[PDB]
Amino acid sequence: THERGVSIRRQLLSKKLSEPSSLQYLPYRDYNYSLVMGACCENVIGYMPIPVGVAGPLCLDEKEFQVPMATTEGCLVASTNRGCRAIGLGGGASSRVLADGMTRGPVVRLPRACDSAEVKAWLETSEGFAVIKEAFDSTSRFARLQKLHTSIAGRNLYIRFQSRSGDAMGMNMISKGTEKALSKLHEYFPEMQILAVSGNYCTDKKPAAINWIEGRGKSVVCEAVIPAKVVREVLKTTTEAMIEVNINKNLVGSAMAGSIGGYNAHAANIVTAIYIACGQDAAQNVGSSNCITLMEASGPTNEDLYISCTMPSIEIGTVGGGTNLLPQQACLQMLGVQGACKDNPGENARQLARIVCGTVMAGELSLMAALAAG
Amino acid sequence: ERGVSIRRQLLSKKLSEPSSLQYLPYRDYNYSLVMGACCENVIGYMPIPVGVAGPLCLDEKEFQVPMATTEGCLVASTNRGCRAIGLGGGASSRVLADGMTRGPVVRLPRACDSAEVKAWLETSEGFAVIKEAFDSTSRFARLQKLHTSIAGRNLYIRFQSRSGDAMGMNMISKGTEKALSKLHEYFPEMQILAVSGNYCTDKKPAAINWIEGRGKSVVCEAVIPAKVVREVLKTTTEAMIEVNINKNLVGSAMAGSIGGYNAHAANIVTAIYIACGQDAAQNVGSSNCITLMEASGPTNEDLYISCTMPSIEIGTVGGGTNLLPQQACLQMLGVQGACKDNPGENARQLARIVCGTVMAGELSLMAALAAGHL
Amino acid sequence: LSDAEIIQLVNLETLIETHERGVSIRRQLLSKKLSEPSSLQYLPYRDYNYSLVMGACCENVIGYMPIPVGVAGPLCLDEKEFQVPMATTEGCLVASTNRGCRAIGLGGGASSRVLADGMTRGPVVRLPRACDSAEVKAWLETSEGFAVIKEAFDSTSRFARLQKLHTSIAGRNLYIRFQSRSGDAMGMNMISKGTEKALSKLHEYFPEMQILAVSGNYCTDKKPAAINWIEGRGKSVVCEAVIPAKVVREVLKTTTEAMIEVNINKNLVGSAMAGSIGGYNAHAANIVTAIYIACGQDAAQNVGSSNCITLMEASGPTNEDLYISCTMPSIEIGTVGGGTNLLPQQACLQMLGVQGACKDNPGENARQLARIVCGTVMAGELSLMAALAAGHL
Amino acid sequence: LSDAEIIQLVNAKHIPAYKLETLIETHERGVSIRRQLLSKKLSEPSSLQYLPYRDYNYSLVMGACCENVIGYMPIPVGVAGPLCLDEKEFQVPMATTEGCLVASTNRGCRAIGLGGGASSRVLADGMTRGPVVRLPRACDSAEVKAWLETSEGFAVIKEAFDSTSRFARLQKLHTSIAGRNLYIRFQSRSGDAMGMNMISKGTEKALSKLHEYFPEMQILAVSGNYCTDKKPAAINWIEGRGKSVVCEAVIPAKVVREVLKTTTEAMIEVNINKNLVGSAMAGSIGGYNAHAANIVTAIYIACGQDAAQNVGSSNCITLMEASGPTNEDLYISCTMPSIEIGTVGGGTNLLPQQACLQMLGVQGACKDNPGENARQLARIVCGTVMAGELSLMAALAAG
């Protein structure tokens, strides 16, 4: 029994604590550890309950979504809910997925820079790419290599592998594919040393200009027009005040702070709340939060508010990892995107990415209105 | 709980799959603590598996670190890093700075006027007046410094202050409002555009946080004996150093990273933050870290490692730390709540634990990448 | 008419005969507006060929500014020896660079490779909605879409060959980065004309599209930008060399170990602490600037052309020798057009054997010059790093 | 006694070509001879034909500005103006080989002049040097950092630093740790000099003093790239380096129409989408402008500044807004936090460059208010950049 195994572990742990009675408030009973153990967590001593609230309906692409948000930050859900209301009263939001492809960026080294330059040229030919793709794609049915971006630093060569991965976030799958392609590359260049399967050129879980500029995972754009009456009555401000704050805070302020990818008010709050509720990798909030929020006067009198959010690097999935646990599957089902999209692999993950971008836009609208109105 | 059950009933009627909520738990949870403080429109809670890594031998003390995660092998890998550190005599850490920030943006009619306000804020009399207004909002709010930046007629003011054992965003924002109200008495022509002009910078990647710090700045170090590198980490000191330089330094530089000179600090920070009731969205800046390794000892075979994190945003009082399950994890570490005798000591100790655990995580993953053990 | 008579008619190159006199009159007129009338006394203007300058390189000309030119070399690069001209007013720069060349020469020379070649222009256009700009982005990503744009782009010149497109969306805005070869010219003018033509063609397919600016800062030209560092701009070059232990000791006055420790902690860790993007070197900008001024390049392009990462490591059977490499992804350079049309700067290009067009292999002179710049930067890095390591200031 | 004899003697493996001047009794002759020696090593011996070398005062250059001199490179100098700034009019010299740069800048000055002029302010002044030192352990480096942050520690360091020059005044110390490494950014005024030499000397003295209190400390490099000098860096953009300046102006609607050939609305739309959004898409730190580097570079070459410093000196954010009764006037401002400039020392010691500094009325030291000539020049650069931004933006907006 897994539940008793966790029980004993807590007893064994209890003796090493200065306050052994602390564990009494950490839950562990009535939980399915079958799905957890050997797949999601080790040395398990219980679980941490995170409150889940709902924001919506989010009117996006002619559909209505009830968005689950796991958070301990007061007013986050209520504020986001107000943004959804403004969007709904304005006829809804529209979104588009611009790119899709998870990456892995290993670093290999050759004896000389002249050699790494030779390897770079070969990878850039249609023939070089084709053989590397064949080796990469042979690891899984969903791993389809789309492109390579190679960069050198002397005798070092950084290779950014970008690939589709069905409805999965893709890290494991893309990593397995990269290992096989690097092995194949080694057969063509025996003098090549594989330094690390990840040379930080992906880039995974670290802020990086490469993710902002080339994208990682899903690149999405969302937009909406909020009528002047709605800006006044629901957001309690004016279109002019919203625009002035957007330019001076999200553009100029972020520029003064030396930000790369942080041209928004609080995309990270929304991304994180949705990620925790839906079994995503919350640590990926680092790059997934990249966003530029733009606002413009619209309509016959420049009284309406046009808003758009562009997020080039949303790392998300509806199969694998934490999405295999039942409570998180319930949240994915709420959105209608749980598991693989059998009819068209990747569609569930793309829909979830659009929902994230649309919810972020609702969050931006609400916070900006509050800052503008005081 | 009855209101929650009813909200769930109403919500289920708007879903494409009315049974979605079946596996989303909600019973046997105390919502009196959540309602009106941590979350709104509550429909239940999301259980995140909690594992333990340790003991972490830090500053002559041993810690059992709780980590909430759904990523397989993260806890086990971190645990291996702790083992290597423990076998090497432990780690040492130091808090270099402490101060949460808020960076509002105000505007004057002309750039010549904003320059005038700036010179004023830089005199001892100007700062004393602002500090008096700022510090009157709370017993624990003490303004340490001001950093101002001009962009034409706009002026960005970065207020930095201690906040006891609280993360401090609320306290600092209140003090900022009072200080600005006071500044407006001296400059009636000044317009307060937004209490946050993204110059803080909160929840967005920013060079200012990396360079000037935000929250707690911490450094930690350890020396791993050659025999431990071989037997516990399964690699050599030379392989570790080569990977650190080419991945964490050169690779991050090729990717255009600001503050991402590490392997996976974000994973550790996020896991600890969720378990301990911190703001997980703050993982964006809190994850900033530079990992350095070098050879030491009699024969240059031992491994010296250090991790420097200039912007850990953390607290042991307020927000999610008011909930019982998260207090249990803080108690496990011996840092729950306020430190009555020396305000801020519990928060500082938690920051040191985070930096030491990150270092354990870096050691383990780097060894795996170096040895080619995936 | 006398000078005093021409002045009263004013209260020039087309009016007066010779150019030197036009400049002389302009100087006399300007003098009146000066609080110190004799300011221009030491600003030379005589014996200079203004015919190549007027209506091409500068306007409202009042003379010329002499910049001292020194020579560093021989630079042993790719089995050839170069005598590098450097225009500078900074003491010890030429001597220091010369020392670096010596170390490289004593070590058997340096090797270099051009990894990429393509100047860029990044305009910004707008559509009524983001859903529309997304459609345009998708259209440009098709083989047929790119085919038509390339056709329009390429028709503007024999040397204009569009290699690729990189598009980025920001709401209803679309930034398009055009990249193309340009023979031996730096290519900004050629690429800008091709861009204009390609955008007109694009407008035929999407009439609702507004061309906001031919340059939307997505190029990026003369501003520090991560896009140039990551995707390159102009010529991307890498050079390397191995300096024998004996040479490090006797010529550079230090040790391989001290050099490596300084490189890692200054060029890597220090630049990381400073929040630098592309500045992982000691002083590439000094060399780039000195060569650019001497060879008629656009000195303002030093901003991105200076991007460089310098790496050092122990080498040889005993790990005693010094391996060094410099990688510069965005060298914006040319041997035809602009300042390279002036005689004194052509003299410096001729010294290097790269002046003008390479009729046999277009672009070869510009590529060779880029390799020389990267090799000279490496010589400069070696020398300054050795000085910092040994403490010889 | 003859060039041919001297050359034969040199070729007899006795003297390197660089120490020619220390043997001949005339600088110009050493140059002439070095050219002849260089000629025989070129694939094309006549290449030096059009590179001038005669009628130039090499006494100021040798041993101070350049070595192995073979001549000089003439850069055309044009004038843009008058630039109406702070109730004064300036005639700005610009050395460039880029067509239309001077004419375009001149058009921007005209628009500014017709609008009543520009206003500017110097917000900060202080050159920096950022050495890197190492302690045995990170716990030791943390200790040095805490010590430097005390009033006593700073006082001791300031005393050693300031003793190098009367113009040197250590304003602050920004330290950052990376494990056992400690980066210390020294910032100080330097009179009218750009200050790199003075600040480096003071840094060396301060580090020697610090080493007396921490003998375990190793000085790795007087410059650890934390200055940061001649490399793009967020620290310069955020904390400033040299002079931080802001300038502004209001261009009347009629002037935007008639002189700039566009509208206020078109200019604002281009500024936001190019200088703000475009630069953000490109991942720029400090490059929120159209072409500040062109103006900075042209002025720097003409005035004897260090042109390689264009890297950080060109940092600039250009902002435009609708202003006036009907929101048709154009308000513009340029903010440059890191202008590295000086009116004494280096290239400013040469006569032709002093002529350009005199044209602006800022040549040499300001006798009655040290640093005032350098500050005035920084304001001129920022105002000229603003004129350049106005003109190019109008051209891009109008098509």
Ligand SMILES: CC(C)n1c(/C=C/[C@@H](O)C[C@@H](O)CC(=O)O)c(-c2ccc(F)cc2)c2ccccc21
């Ligand atoms: C409940 C929440 C949406 N939320 C936050 C605060 C949100 C923070 O987490 C992120 C924010 O710091 C990002 C930024 O704007 O830089 C604020 C708020 C923000 C800035 C401020 F100065 C004072 C209060 C706020 C105000 C009204 C309603 C909800 C609010």
Ligand SMILES: CC(C)n1c(/C=C/[C@@H](O)C[C@@H](O)CC(=O)O)c(-c2ccc(F)cc2)c2ccccc21
């Ligand atoms: C369980 C975990 C510690 N964890 C991760 C992978 C961890 C990732 O989340 C972060 C990582 O992506 C950061 C980076 O290094 O860029 C890997 C791993 C990492 C990179 C790779 F190519 C293959 C496997 C790994 C290997 C062995 C044991 C644990 C591991």
Ligand SMILES: CC(C)n1c(/C=C/[C@@H](O)C[C@@H](O)CC(=O)O)c(-c2ccc(F)cc2)c2ccccc21
């Ligand atoms: C003649 C020159 C090559 N050059 C420079 C100084 C070079 C500077 O322009 C760039 C440098 O500042 C870049 C950097 O290192 O960050 C120095 C020098 C550098 C730092 C120092 F503290 C003192 C002197 C130097 C020393 C010996 C020989 C030539 C030198």
Ligand SMILES: CC(C)n1c(/C=C/[C@@H](O)C[C@@H](O)CC(=O)O)c(-c2ccc(F)cc2)c2ccccc21
């Ligand atoms: C003479 C000059 C003022 N100058 C330049 C070109 C200026 C370039 O050096 C810098 C520019 O590239 C910076 C940028 O905006 O990214 C252009 C120009 C600029 C961009 C373009 F697509 C076409 C022409 C231009 C147009 C009219 C008048 C002068 C101009």
Ligand SMILES: Nc1ncnc2c1ncn2[C@@H]1O[C@H](COP(=O)(O)OP(=O)(O)O)[C@@H](O)[C@H]1O
């Ligand atoms: N529609 C789908 N999209 C992606 N993966 C799918 C799908 N259906 C099934 N799978 C399988 O589930 C796995 C995805 O989870 P996992 O292996 O943990 O990798 P990842 O880290 O990408 O989530 C793959 O082994 C794949 O074969």
Ligand SMILES: Nc1ncnc2c1ncn2[C@@H]1O[C@H](COP(=O)(O)OP(=O)(O)O)[C@@H](O)[C@H]1O
């Ligand atoms: N005035 C100078 N002009 C050009 N190069 C110089 C000059 N002084 C020194 N050098 C360069 O520096 C190298 C070092 O010479 P020097 O400083 O005399 O030291 P050492 O002779 O002890 O090696 C020389 O080989 C030369 O390349």
Ligand SMILES: Nc1ncnc2c1ncn2[C@@H]1O[C@H](COP(=O)(O)OP(=O)(O)O)[C@@H](O)[C@H]1O
């Ligand atoms: N205003 C100034 N700013 C910077 N350096 C200055 C200034 N005035 C003088 N100097 C420096 O001091 C040197 C000598 O001038 P100064 O100190 O005034 O003494 P003196 O009495 O010999 O003129 C000059 O060569 C220059 O380097």
